[PDB]
Design an enzyme around this catalytic site. Sequence first.
Site, PDB file in Angstrom:
ATOM      1  N   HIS A 106      52.975  86.349 -10.083  1.00 34.68           N
ATOM      2  CA  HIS A 106      52.017  86.734  -9.033  1.00 34.68           C
ATOM      3  C   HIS A 106      51.875  88.157  -8.803  1.00 34.68           C
ATOM      4  N   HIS A 107      52.410  89.184  -9.717  1.00 35.58           N
ATOM      5  CA  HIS A 107      51.947  90.301  -9.883  1.00 35.58           C
ATOM      6  C   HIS A 107      50.713  90.495 -10.691  1.00 35.58           C
TER       7      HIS A 107
ATOM      8  N   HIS B  43      59.870  91.478 -10.443  1.00 41.28           N
ATOM      9  CA  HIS B  43      60.430  90.438  -9.123  1.00 41.28           C
ATOM     10  C   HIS B  43      61.776  90.494  -8.801  1.00 41.28           C
TER      11      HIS B  43
ATOM     12  N   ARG C  78      44.261 100.298  -3.515  1.00 40.69           N
ATOM     13  CA  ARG C  78      45.421 101.371  -3.742  1.00 40.69           C
ATOM     14  C   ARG C  78      45.109 102.388  -4.774  1.00 40.69           C
TER      15      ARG C  78
ATOM     16  N   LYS D 148      67.949  82.319   6.391  1.00 42.98           N
ATOM     17  CA  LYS D 148      68.706  83.660   6.946  1.00 42.98           C
ATOM     18  C   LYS D 148      68.124  84.216   8.062  1.00 42.98           C
TER      19      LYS D 148
ATOM     20  N   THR E 146      64.571  82.081   2.720  1.00 48.30           N
ATOM     21  CA  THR E 146      64.735  83.234   3.526  1.00 48.30           C
ATOM     22  C   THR E 146      64.728  82.957   4.826  1.00 48.30           C
TER      23      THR E 146
ATOM     24  N   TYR F 207      64.038  91.780  -5.077  1.00 45.97           N
ATOM     25  CA  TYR F 207      65.283  91.026  -4.202  1.00 45.97           C
ATOM     26  C   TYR F 207      66.635  91.908  -4.390  1.00 45.97           C
TER      27      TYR F 207
ATOM     28  N   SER G 184      73.717  90.818   8.126  1.00 44.86           N
ATOM     29  CA  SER G 184      74.682  89.865   8.481  1.00 44.86           C
ATOM     30  C   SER G 184      75.877  90.411   9.345  1.00 44.86           C
TER      31      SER G 184
ATOM     32  N   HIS H  14      56.954 109.204  -6.282  1.00 49.29           N
ATOM     33  CA  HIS H  14      57.451 108.715  -4.806  1.00 49.29           C
ATOM     34  C   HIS H  14      58.212 107.440  -5.349  1.00 49.29           C
TER      35      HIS H  14
ATOM     36  N   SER I  70      73.085 102.869 -16.080  1.00 49.33           N
ATOM     37  CA  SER I  70      74.070 102.941 -14.814  1.00 49.33           C
ATOM     38  C   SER I  70      74.271 101.669 -14.038  1.00 49.33           C
ATOM     39  N   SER I  71      72.957 101.185 -13.590  1.00 53.02           N
ATOM     40  CA  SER I  71      73.045  99.778 -12.927  1.00 53.02           C
ATOM     41  C   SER I  71      73.544  98.627 -13.817  1.00 53.02           C
TER      42      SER I  71
ATOM     43  N   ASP J   5      90.823  99.003  -6.093  1.00 49.93           N
ATOM     44  CA  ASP J   5      89.780  99.864  -6.473  1.00 49.93           C
ATOM     45  C   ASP J   5      88.840  98.608  -7.234  1.00 49.93           C
TER      46      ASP J   5
ATOM     47  N   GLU K 184      63.802  92.986  -9.125  1.00 49.01           N
ATOM     48  CA  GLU K 184      64.304  94.089  -8.679  1.00 49.01           C
ATOM     49  C   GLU K 184      63.845  94.203  -7.146  1.00 49.01           C
TER      50      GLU K 184
ATOM     51  N   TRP L  66      53.975 103.337 -10.876  1.00 48.47           N
ATOM     52  CA  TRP L  66      55.602 103.146 -11.278  1.00 48.47           C
ATOM     53  C   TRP L  66      55.566 101.860 -12.139  1.00 48.47           C
TER      54      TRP L  66
HETATM   55  C1  HEA Z   1      62.109  94.466  -0.509  1.00 50.33           C
HETATM   56  C2  HEA Z   1      61.282  93.974  -1.366  1.00 50.33           C
HETATM   57  C3  HEA Z   1      60.453  93.059  -1.358  1.00 50.33           C
HETATM   58  C4  HEA Z   1      60.524  91.855  -1.077  1.00 50.33           C
HETATM   59  C5  HEA Z   1      61.940  91.171  -0.235  1.00 50.33           C
HETATM   60  C6  HEA Z   1      59.502  90.768  -1.101  1.00 50.33           C
HETATM   61  C7  HEA Z   1      59.142  89.575  -0.741  1.00 50.33           C
HETATM   62  C8  HEA Z   1      58.074  88.920  -0.905  1.00 50.33           C
HETATM   63  N1  HEA Z   1      56.888  89.299  -1.567  1.00 50.33           N
HETATM   64 FE1  HEA Z   1      56.623  91.123  -2.333  1.00 50.33          FE
HETATM   65  N2  HEA Z   1      56.322  92.814  -3.145  1.00 50.33           N
HETATM   66  C9  HEA Z   1      57.269  94.080  -3.267  1.00 50.33           C
HETATM   67  C10 HEA Z   1      58.410  93.931  -2.534  1.00 50.33           C
HETATM   68  C11 HEA Z   1      58.895  93.067  -1.919  1.00 50.33           C
HETATM   69  N3  HEA Z   1      58.464  91.718  -1.815  1.00 50.33           N
HETATM   70  C12 HEA Z   1      56.703  95.256  -3.927  1.00 50.33           C
HETATM   71  C13 HEA Z   1      57.421  96.592  -4.050  1.00 50.33           C
HETATM   72  C14 HEA Z   1      55.278  94.723  -4.372  1.00 50.33           C
HETATM   73  C15 HEA Z   1      54.473  95.477  -5.105  1.00 50.33           C
HETATM   74  C16 HEA Z   1      54.906  95.821  -6.312  1.00 50.33           C
HETATM   75  C17 HEA Z   1      53.456  96.886  -6.930  1.00 50.33           C
HETATM   76  O1  HEA Z   1      52.483  96.431  -7.230  1.00 50.33           O
HETATM   77  O2  HEA Z   1      54.013  98.138  -6.847  1.00 50.33           O
HETATM   78  C18 HEA Z   1      55.259  93.306  -3.823  1.00 50.33           C
HETATM   79  C19 HEA Z   1      54.171  92.504  -4.164  1.00 50.33           C
HETATM   80  C20 HEA Z   1      54.165  91.152  -4.186  1.00 50.33           C
HETATM   81  C21 HEA Z   1      52.846  90.384  -4.623  1.00 50.33           C
HETATM   82  C22 HEA Z   1      51.631  90.889  -5.437  1.00 50.33           C
HETATM   83  C23 HEA Z   1      50.763  91.127  -4.746  1.00 50.33           C
HETATM   84  C24 HEA Z   1      49.481  91.951  -5.514  1.00 50.33           C
HETATM   85  O3  HEA Z   1      49.939  92.819  -6.052  1.00 50.33           O
HETATM   86  O4  HEA Z   1      48.370  91.349  -5.438  1.00 50.33           O
HETATM   87  C25 HEA Z   1      53.107  89.100  -3.845  1.00 50.33           C
HETATM   88  C26 HEA Z   1      52.459  87.755  -4.644  1.00 50.33           C
HETATM   89  O5  HEA Z   1      52.724  86.657  -4.131  1.00 50.33           O
HETATM   90  C27 HEA Z   1      54.506  89.174  -3.185  1.00 50.33           C
HETATM   91  C28 HEA Z   1      54.922  88.123  -2.389  1.00 50.33           C
HETATM   92  C29 HEA Z   1      56.266  88.012  -1.664  1.00 50.33           C
HETATM   93  C30 HEA Z   1      56.696  86.858  -1.315  1.00 50.33           C
HETATM   94  C31 HEA Z   1      56.172  85.663  -1.161  1.00 50.33           C
HETATM   95  C32 HEA Z   1      58.043  87.345  -0.598  1.00 50.33           C
HETATM   96  C33 HEA Z   1      59.032  86.475  -0.050  1.00 50.33           C
HETATM   97  O6  HEA Z   1      60.532  86.635  -0.700  1.00 50.33           O
HETATM   98  C34 HEA Z   1      59.087  86.856   1.616  1.00 50.33           C
HETATM   99  C35 HEA Z   1      59.698  85.521   2.393  1.00 50.33           C
HETATM  100  C36 HEA Z   1      59.980  86.009   3.586  1.00 50.33           C
HETATM  101  C37 HEA Z   1      59.437  85.523   4.736  1.00 50.33           C
HETATM  102  C38 HEA Z   1      58.290  84.310   4.433  1.00 50.33           C
HETATM  103  C39 HEA Z   1      59.657  85.743   6.012  1.00 50.33           C
HETATM  104  C40 HEA Z   1      60.999  85.256   6.742  1.00 50.33           C
HETATM  105  C41 HEA Z   1      60.688  83.632   6.824  1.00 50.33           C
HETATM  106  C42 HEA Z   1      60.575  82.833   7.912  1.00 50.33           C
HETATM  107  C43 HEA Z   1      60.692  83.343   9.530  1.00 50.33           C
HETATM  108  C44 HEA Z   1      60.449  81.417   7.981  1.00 50.33           C
HETATM  109  C45 HEA Z   1      59.273  80.708   8.154  1.00 50.33           C
HETATM  110  C46 HEA Z   1      58.248  81.161   7.337  1.00 50.33           C
HETATM  111  C47 HEA Z   1      57.093  80.462   6.633  1.00 50.33           C
HETATM  112  C48 HEA Z   1      56.985  78.964   6.697  1.00 50.33           C
HETATM  113  C49 HEA Z   1      56.081  81.082   6.104  1.00 50.33           C
HETATM  114  N4  HEA Z   1      54.817  90.377  -3.102  1.00 50.33           N
HETATM  115  C1  HEA Z   2      62.049 101.896  -1.319  1.00 49.98           C
HETATM  116  C2  HEA Z   2      60.858 101.945  -1.528  1.00 49.98           C
HETATM  117  C3  HEA Z   2      59.858 102.635  -0.646  1.00 49.98           C
HETATM  118  C4  HEA Z   2      59.958 103.662   0.491  1.00 49.98           C
HETATM  119  C5  HEA Z   2      61.251 103.803   1.487  1.00 49.98           C
HETATM  120  C6  HEA Z   2      58.893 104.130   0.668  1.00 49.98           C
HETATM  121  C7  HEA Z   2      58.464 105.146   1.777  1.00 49.98           C
HETATM  122  C8  HEA Z   2      57.155 105.562   2.270  1.00 49.98           C
HETATM  123  N1  HEA Z   2      55.967 105.494   1.314  1.00 49.98           N
HETATM  124 FE1  HEA Z   2      55.959 104.146  -0.313  1.00 49.98          FE
HETATM  125  N2  HEA Z   2      55.767 103.471  -1.909  1.00 49.98           N
HETATM  126  C9  HEA Z   2      56.652 102.669  -2.703  1.00 49.98           C
HETATM  127  C10 HEA Z   2      57.822 102.297  -2.465  1.00 49.98           C
HETATM  128  C11 HEA Z   2      58.437 103.054  -1.066  1.00 49.98           C
HETATM  129  N3  HEA Z   2      57.593 103.797  -0.109  1.00 49.98           N
HETATM  130  C12 HEA Z   2      56.196 102.185  -3.887  1.00 49.98           C
HETATM  131  C13 HEA Z   2      56.976 101.400  -4.877  1.00 49.98           C
HETATM  132  C14 HEA Z   2      54.676 102.413  -4.127  1.00 49.98           C
HETATM  133  C15 HEA Z   2      53.866 102.228  -5.190  1.00 49.98           C
HETATM  134  C16 HEA Z   2      53.699 103.241  -6.113  1.00 49.98           C
HETATM  135  C17 HEA Z   2      52.492 103.107  -7.302  1.00 49.98           C
HETATM  136  O1  HEA Z   2      51.312 102.556  -6.607  1.00 49.98           O
HETATM  137  O2  HEA Z   2      52.681 103.096  -8.353  1.00 49.98           O
HETATM  138  C18 HEA Z   2      54.458 103.299  -2.915  1.00 49.98           C
HETATM  139  C19 HEA Z   2      53.335 103.749  -2.649  1.00 49.98           C
HETATM  140  C20 HEA Z   2      53.120 104.357  -1.399  1.00 49.98           C
HETATM  141  C21 HEA Z   2      51.507 104.708  -0.921  1.00 49.98           C
HETATM  142  C22 HEA Z   2      50.310 104.322  -1.666  1.00 49.98           C
HETATM  143  C23 HEA Z   2      49.669 105.196  -2.606  1.00 49.98           C
HETATM  144  C24 HEA Z   2      48.479 104.799  -3.398  1.00 49.98           C
HETATM  145  O3  HEA Z   2      48.340 103.752  -3.356  1.00 49.98           O
HETATM  146  O4  HEA Z   2      47.865 105.925  -3.713  1.00 49.98           O
HETATM  147  C25 HEA Z   2      51.777 105.172   0.491  1.00 49.98           C
HETATM  148  C26 HEA Z   2      50.777 105.602   1.217  1.00 49.98           C
HETATM  149  O5  HEA Z   2      50.850 106.040   2.422  1.00 49.98           O
HETATM  150  C27 HEA Z   2      53.185 105.210   0.818  1.00 49.98           C
HETATM  151  C28 HEA Z   2      53.754 106.010   1.702  1.00 49.98           C
HETATM  152  C29 HEA Z   2      55.089 106.131   1.979  1.00 49.98           C
HETATM  153  C30 HEA Z   2      55.602 106.613   3.448  1.00 49.98           C
HETATM  154  C31 HEA Z   2      54.652 107.376   4.255  1.00 49.98           C
HETATM  155  C32 HEA Z   2      56.960 106.503   3.253  1.00 49.98           C
HETATM  156  C33 HEA Z   2      58.072 106.821   4.239  1.00 49.98           C
HETATM  157  O6  HEA Z   2      57.498 108.518   4.701  1.00 49.98           O
HETATM  158  C34 HEA Z   2      58.217 106.013   5.460  1.00 49.98           C
HETATM  159  C35 HEA Z   2      59.463 106.381   6.075  1.00 49.98           C
HETATM  160  C36 HEA Z   2      60.565 106.334   5.541  1.00 49.98           C
HETATM  161  C37 HEA Z   2      61.625 107.358   5.066  1.00 49.98           C
HETATM  162  C38 HEA Z   2      61.171 108.562   5.523  1.00 49.98           C
HETATM  163  C39 HEA Z   2      62.917 106.913   4.437  1.00 49.98           C
HETATM  164  C40 HEA Z   2      64.006 107.554   4.909  1.00 49.98           C
HETATM  165  C41 HEA Z   2      65.241 107.539   4.116  1.00 49.98           C
HETATM  166  C42 HEA Z   2      66.076 108.648   3.620  1.00 49.98           C
HETATM  167  C43 HEA Z   2      65.764 109.825   3.875  1.00 49.98           C
HETATM  168  C44 HEA Z   2      67.645 108.048   3.026  1.00 49.98           C
HETATM  169  C45 HEA Z   2      68.587 108.492   3.952  1.00 49.98           C
HETATM  170  C46 HEA Z   2      69.910 108.282   3.439  1.00 49.98           C
HETATM  171  C47 HEA Z   2      71.158 107.933   4.143  1.00 49.98           C
HETATM  172  C48 HEA Z   2      71.263 107.703   5.527  1.00 49.98           C
HETATM  173  C49 HEA Z   2      72.343 107.630   3.198  1.00 49.98           C
HETATM  174  N4  HEA Z   2      53.887 104.961  -0.504  1.00 49.98           N
END
Ligand code: HEA
Ligand code: HEA
Lengths: 44, 258, 49, 513, 143, 40, 72, 227, 56
Positions: D290-291, D240, D438, D319, D316, D244, D255, D61, D156-157, D91, D242, D126
């Site tokens: 922080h992970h 991390h 989880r 923005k 952030t 962003y 935007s 997934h 690729s990337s 291009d 990734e 993953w």
């Molecule tokens: C789009 C992807 C994406 C983005 C942008 C972020 C953004 C952030 N993430 Fe998240 N994060 C994930 C995807 C993302 N994360 C994923 C996939 C994992 C799990 C990986 C895994 O374990 O599988 C994860 C896990 C993860 C962890 C680990 C938790 C754990 O496993 O125990 C932490 C720890 O600090 C973290 C923190 C943050 C923070 C602080 C931001 C910041 O960048 C957020 C900043 C944004 C805001 C704060 C909101 C807007 C701001 C305002 C309106 C201003 C005013 C706000 C304040 C004064 C607070 N994230």
């Molecule tokens: C981009 C990242 C992404 C997206 C979109 C999603 C989408 C969803 N994910 Fe998740 N998920 C992860 C990234 C994401 N996930 C990751 C990183 C983990 C952790 C794995 C691990 O623990 O190792 C995770 C784990 C995770 C769990 C935890 C499993 C566990 O801990 O045992 C669950 C549980 O409910 C969940 C549910 C869902 C559901 C219901 C949706 C969706 O059904 C929600 C609805 C969204 C859609 C249906 C997508 C639609 C988009 C398209 C079809 C593209 C269309 C294209 C064009 C128009 C060009 N996902």
Amino acid sequence: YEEGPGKNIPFSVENKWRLLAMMTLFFGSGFAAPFFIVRHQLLK
Amino acid sequence: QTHAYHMVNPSPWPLTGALSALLMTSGLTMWFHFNSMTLLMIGLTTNMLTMYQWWRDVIRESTFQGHHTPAVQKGLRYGMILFIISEVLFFTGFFWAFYHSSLAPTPELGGCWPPTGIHPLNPLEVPLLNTSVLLASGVSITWAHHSLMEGDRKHMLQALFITITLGVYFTLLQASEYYEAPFTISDGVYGSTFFVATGFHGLHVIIGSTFLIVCFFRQLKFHFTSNHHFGFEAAAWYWHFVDVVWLFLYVSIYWWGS
Amino acid sequence: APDFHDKYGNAVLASGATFCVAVWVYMATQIGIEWNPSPVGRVTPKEWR
Amino acid sequence: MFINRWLFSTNHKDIGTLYLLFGAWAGMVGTALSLLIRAELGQPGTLLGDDQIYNVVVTAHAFVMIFFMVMPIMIGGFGNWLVPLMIGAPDMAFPRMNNMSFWLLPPSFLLLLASSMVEAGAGTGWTVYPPLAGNLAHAGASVDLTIFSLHLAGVSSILGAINFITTIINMKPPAMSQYQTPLFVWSVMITAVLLLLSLPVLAAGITMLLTDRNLNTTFFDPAGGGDPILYQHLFWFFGHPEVYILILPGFGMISHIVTYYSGKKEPFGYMGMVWAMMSIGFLGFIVWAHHMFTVGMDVDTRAYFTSATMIIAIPTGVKVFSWLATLHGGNIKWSPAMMWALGFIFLFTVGGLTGIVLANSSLDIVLHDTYYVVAHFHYVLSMGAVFAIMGGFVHWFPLFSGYTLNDTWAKIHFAIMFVGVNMTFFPQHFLGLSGMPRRYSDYPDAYTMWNTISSMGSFISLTAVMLMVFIIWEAFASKREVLTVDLTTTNLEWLNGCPPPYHTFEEPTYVNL
Amino acid sequence: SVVKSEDYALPSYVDRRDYPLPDVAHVKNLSASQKALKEKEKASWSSLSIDEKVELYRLKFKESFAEMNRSTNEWKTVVGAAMFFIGFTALLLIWEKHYVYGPIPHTFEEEWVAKQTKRMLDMKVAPIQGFSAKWDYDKNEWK
Amino acid sequence: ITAKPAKTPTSPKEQAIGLSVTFLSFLLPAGWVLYHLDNY
Amino acid sequence: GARTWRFLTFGLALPSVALCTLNSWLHSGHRERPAFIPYHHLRIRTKPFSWGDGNHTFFHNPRVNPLPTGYE
Amino acid sequence: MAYPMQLGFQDATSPIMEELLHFHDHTLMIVFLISSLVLYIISLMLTTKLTHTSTMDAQEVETIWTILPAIILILIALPSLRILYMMDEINNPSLTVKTMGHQWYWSYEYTDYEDLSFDSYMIPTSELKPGELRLLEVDNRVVLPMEMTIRMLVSSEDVLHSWAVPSLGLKTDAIPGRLNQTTLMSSRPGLYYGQCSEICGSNHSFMPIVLELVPLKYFEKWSASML
Amino acid sequence: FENRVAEKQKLFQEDNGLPVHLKGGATDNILYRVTMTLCLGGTLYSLYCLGWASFP
Ligand code: HEA
Ligand code: HEA
Ligand SMILES: CCCCC/C=C\C/C=C/C/C=C\C/C=C\CCCC(=O)O[C@H](COC(=O)CCCCCCCCCCCCCCCCC)COP(=O)(O)OCCN
Ligand SMILES: CCCCCC/C=C\CCCCCCCCCC(=O)O[C@H](COC(=O)CCCCCCCCCCCCCCC)COP(=O)(O)OC[C@@H](O)CO
Ligand SMILES: CCCCCCCCCCO[C@@H]1O[C@H](CO)[C@@H](O[C@H]2O[C@H](CO)[C@@H](O)[C@H](O)[C@H]2O)[C@H](O)[C@H]1O
Ligand SMILES: CCCCCCCCCCO[C@@H]1O[C@H](CO)[C@@H](O[C@H]2O[C@H](CO)[C@@H](O)[C@H](O)[C@H]2O)[C@H](O)[C@H]1O
Ligand SMILES: C[C@H](CCC(=O)O)[C@H]1CC[C@H]2[C@@H]3[C@H](O)C[C@@H]4C[C@H](O)CC[C@]4(C)[C@H]3C[C@H](O)[C@]12C
Ligand code: NA
């Protein structure tokens, strides 16, 4: 090469019913695949 | 067109390259798990065919067809710099592994570095010679560059031949040092770090040597002008990269790690 | 000239809302879903030892 | 002609179209996997009766959603279609290498589906942590096929990042500085720099895992003096950045969409938006551990990673406030794309704020490896990336195709998806606070109510996905051809018509100093 | 006023309340009577009839502000259709409960839950706020 | 945006067919697998 | 200029290589191999190698590389 | 343990968990207010026909929306770090207990005085005694003295695991070749439950942790009887 | 050796509509056919291998 709407794509949109079939097979095959992988792993 | 950029003819090499990647990776899988080299040997073959035809075509487009305007050459400069940066970060991961293991040796090692039962190579013998060889090759390639800019065909060829000979000497010395080493890749994290980091470096020396040999033959065929010779520039930048990676390996793994 | 929304919007809103409520209430209450709510104020504790 | 056009492409538009088709197909795979997850959890007990298979489904997934849906759509699809058009370039810099970035992805995906079909699959998460991912606990080919899938996606990337950086630096009109490029172009350049630096470190780490599995290295094996924690550092040093990488092109599209449907010529605070994206990119490399707050690292290291992580909220926030200030005073057009963007601003904000809760290592001890983390990233990542993708798709579909969508159907689609994702993920916060781990196939009975509701939400989003496919069919079936597009004076990608000709900017734009 | 695909590079007409005076007239080609009306417009506008004034407006513009800004019944279709498809989703969930899900574990039986509840109160689960806090140990009932 | 009227209009009946076929293409294969899980 | 870099090539760089070649040459010749000790952190075998009998490293030298059971 | 329909944290069993609850309350108030303010501002921007579409000056307003967030983050960080450094502070434990993770069960070693060790497996659902909790009970609980500072050392003999007890604020990864330390102090007797918190393969869901907190004299006799 | 670049410039600029990968003549076609045959044949063999490896 052909330019313009319906010509800048690798699939035909000449017939909406053939297109429905093509889109059905395309998206349906992706959505079905994980169910059939689970079935495969269960059947070993 | 009234811009200076290159609209590339539709090409099969991206698809043959992608498929060669599938065959090499599925082939490594087949070798590691199903006791067979067949897919891997097909993948290596198609990879070499793809690289040969693709870079042949770039020579056709530039030397023979004139599509490398200054704007196009500027893009290729950026591309090569960015490629080298990505290769620096790849090696950074191996150096991180090395420092992680050696700065905090675990009890399994005897809690020391080098580990109990590891007899490092003397860094003042072949490793020092290898250092002299790659540094010398950095001087000779610089002579080759200035000879080409000054329009001197004979001295460019002599300097580039010397540079290639030194790259080959390094490779033969490293092969001999691999065979003679009393430790192996299976000798815990010392062998792991040593052979994977120096092994990837060795591969990059072979790639850079091959690139210099391509430049040597292109020079023999008069492809380069005194002002236009980006393939040579790129090969020189790559070769400097291989030199610098070696100096970091020498200081880190061979000397500080001994 | 009246469009799709002028002609059908009232019927689409009334029928969609009626259908959605009816089918979710039936799913939630008539087919044996175990929601496992809080026992607080609901369950009479019984001797277990 | 078909093979030459579609297999041998050197055209940024056609390659972008290939990426969008690939990513849409991948999204159906990733959605089916997500529905299997929620079906297993939708009532207490076992559904599949095979938790190795559950673990494989969860692993696949994530890889499918991240590597085959979001990155190909945002960077390969929108990036290839829009970046050359928005700078007046004819291009990409490397139009043939661009086609290889595309064609590496079908084989990458094939290796991932091979991993799931051989032996018992890669049930690793993953993250692919050893020793669970090693040759004892995961003997056989599955994890190796997963590693090679990641190698091909990585190549690729990396090559795509080289392409985008070179194109954006080198192929603007000579009068156009970096500070006269649109924000989407900035968002792609910054994402490309993150890819260039991060993916090689992942490549090194998974290569070490490959040699530990097949060549008797011991990078991660304490028997040889290795350390499983080293793998985690290499993985998260990539991972991390990734997250962003997954959102930045979405910030760029948001935007453009908020500007466009506010009737504005420009986003509020352009240089602040550039500053914010570059600050997020930079800070994104110094926060990875922080992970790893539960692995046993030193208190002062925890204090540093807490503090550095919280700093990301400042750029952030600039923005988010700048998007609000773009709406301010707008002639608001309530288009479906605008609804997607407004949903993005709110849902992204909620997920970013739960990230700030998690940044606090003391609280993360109790929230790590719980559904609170799953709730955080399905808000910021899952909803944020998907809402930006859907916004961009409905905004630019008429540019790419020359045809219009049915706006009423598109608004229905939005409404169903908004209900479904919130029903699915909001209750996962309660599950995490109350201690549900989880990566579990089943849960103590107390957790039944929120799991039940979550799984019912998953089906509402399925209905939205099926409707989306119908809506695309109905556009191509009806053939409503675009006539006039407003605001072309500040949206160059539209100025060559819909769809633009195969070759655009054969004669470059005129821009004086 | 037929707008053609091949016209995309020419100045175009828009009705936008933020762009009140568009780049071109709605109607570019004039009949004999419309030409006479444009000549009449060069004289006192007091001499134009209400009908002539409207005809001049409709040559220049397609929709009035009132027309371009009108509200619609579209919200009814959108909300109703969304609720229809959300209702359809509940049919899928009924199908899943009937054909996919088997029995849940025996720990959800009423008598199990009554015994488990007592045992949770005996071990004082969440005694400060969450659970046992809500039990009256003196009166042997929920507060 | 402005656009031409549909070159090949899709009537309400045609839309019901396209929607039905699209939903069935997702629901029937998955439904077949999930119905037969016990058998697997 | 080219003249200066040729001067450095022949006057400094190649003489350095000749001196380091001399140094390596003089310190060549086999050192006495150490007693075999079956340390558990060395001669790692978690999976057979994909060549030969599965128990020999890729550039195995019988003189200096013992197997897990000792020198051949 | 968690109870049905629970929204927040389990009730605190340890002083550090008490601290974490009050810190979470403070942080969640901030998350609520900022979420609410963004939603409200969206609604305010979208509910007027008044327009201003000419270029707007950004620099004055960017000072407010950098400084105010910086102050808020400092107000979160200060109490966050105070708790981080309180957990780390030197407490002098009375007892050391080791736990080893395995696929799929925990072993416990109490080797300060005698060689006490045992394995702790989930009770299968079909073998639960009436009133017992599905997926949470073990055969052999981790008996510990209440109101005493205990050093827990965590490791693994195979893959990664993670030893967690939410109500005590505990989660420490179990890594082969590594001995991770944490401290445990229960303010109360009773049974405190947790679950393996690092994916460790097919039975990750089914290797729980049960602590049994009793007076020292009961712990000493239990210890003697378990040799 | 002698500088024959002008003769290769004339060959590769000939107005014959050939793409650059075939513009050298008949040897280019042979090498292309060998490369694409090995790639497509190898890919079909890799799918056969997946089929084999997908069962015990
Ligand atoms: C789009 C992807 C994406 C983005 C942008 C972020 C953004 C952030 N993430 Fe998240 N994060 C994930 C995807 C993302 N994360 C994923 C996939 C994992 C799990 C990986 C895994 O374990 O599988 C994860 C896990 C993860 C962890 C680990 C938790 C754990 O496993 O125990 C932490 C720890 O600090 C973290 C923190 C943050 C923070 C602080 C931001 C910041 O960048 C957020 C900043 C944004 C805001 C704060 C909101 C807007 C701001 C305002 C309106 C201003 C005013 C706000 C304040 C004064 C607070 N994230
Ligand atoms: C981009 C990242 C992404 C997206 C979109 C999603 C989408 C969803 N994910 Fe998740 N998920 C992860 C990234 C994401 N996930 C990751 C990183 C983990 C952790 C794995 C691990 O623990 O190792 C995770 C784990 C995770 C769990 C935890 C499993 C566990 O801990 O045992 C669950 C549980 O409910 C969940 C549910 C869902 C559901 C219901 C949706 C969706 O059904 C929600 C609805 C969204 C859609 C249906 C997508 C639609 C988009 C398209 C079809 C593209 C269309 C294209 C064009 C128009 C060009 N996902
Ligand atoms: C003169 C030195 C030049 C090196 C050339 C020699 C060998 C082949 C290629 C090398 C490539 C480099 C590194 C790959 C990993 C391991 C090899 C390390 C170098 C080496 O050759 O190590 C040898 C072991 O080789 C072994 O296991 C053999 C292993 C052979 C199979 C390698 C597996 C390939 C790994 C996959 C590569 C992934 C690339 C990822 C790219 C990133 C994409 C994003 C050492 O011999 P030994 O007998 O243990 O000790 C000496 C005792 N007298
Ligand atoms: C035994 C080991 C097997 C492993 C496989 C790899 C082995 C060998 C690969 C060796 C690399 C050879 C590259 C040859 C490039 C020839 C084309 C060339 O050099 O093309 C030049 C352009 O540069 C350009 O494209 C620059 C092109 C840059 C490409 C090189 C990058 C190195 C490649 C690394 C490959 C993978 C390594 C990854 C390792 C993990 C042409 O422009 P000019 O020179 O200005 O000429 C024009 C003038 O004549 C006009 O007057
Ligand atoms: C997460 C995605 C899934 C969401 C749920 C899908 C909704 C259901 C779609 C219908 O699927 C079908 O259901 C039938 C039953 O209603 C099945 O017939 C089965 O049962 C019939 C009645 O017993 C028999 O007549 C048939 O032979 C037998 O295959 C049939 O196979 C299956 O395709
Ligand atoms: C352009 C078209 C592309 C080319 C396609 C090539 C297809 C032909 C491949 C030959 O197949 C081989 O068959 C052998 C069996 O006959 C296998 O032997 C291997 O398996 C044997 C099992 O008997 C063992 O003895 C050894 O591991 C080993 O010899 C080997 O793995 C396998 O590759
Ligand atoms: C005679 C010939 C002239 C080249 C020409 O102008 O075409 C010379 C000039 C430079 C020579 C090369 C360089 O001087 C360096 C090398 C010197 C070695 O002694 C022979 C091979 C060697 C690689 C030479 C081969 C050949 O004799 C070359 C190529
Ligand atoms: Na389950």
